[PDB]
Amino acid sequence: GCPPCPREHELVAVPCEGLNNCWFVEACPPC
């Protein structure tokens, strides 16, 4: 799952805001 509230994760290989893209920033939105 996702760790405590993140800040910025470099999703360079696979961009976030997608379907089965975000590794661990989806359920845990950056503060």
Can you describe what's shown?
This protein is low in regular secondary structure. The protein has one domain (1-31). 0% of the residues lie in helices and 0% in strands. It contains no helices and no strands. The protein is globular. The two termini are 17 Å apart.
| Percent of residues in beta strands | under 5%
Count of folded domains: 1
Count of discrete alpha- or pi-helical segments spanning 4 or more residues: 0
The radius of gyration is 9 Å
- Tell the overall outline: globular
Annotation, overall tally of beta strands: 0
Task: Quickly give the structural class.
Answer: little secondary structure
- Helix % is under 10%
Termini separation comes to 17 Å
Q: Biggest sheet, open or closed, and with what strands and sense?
A: none
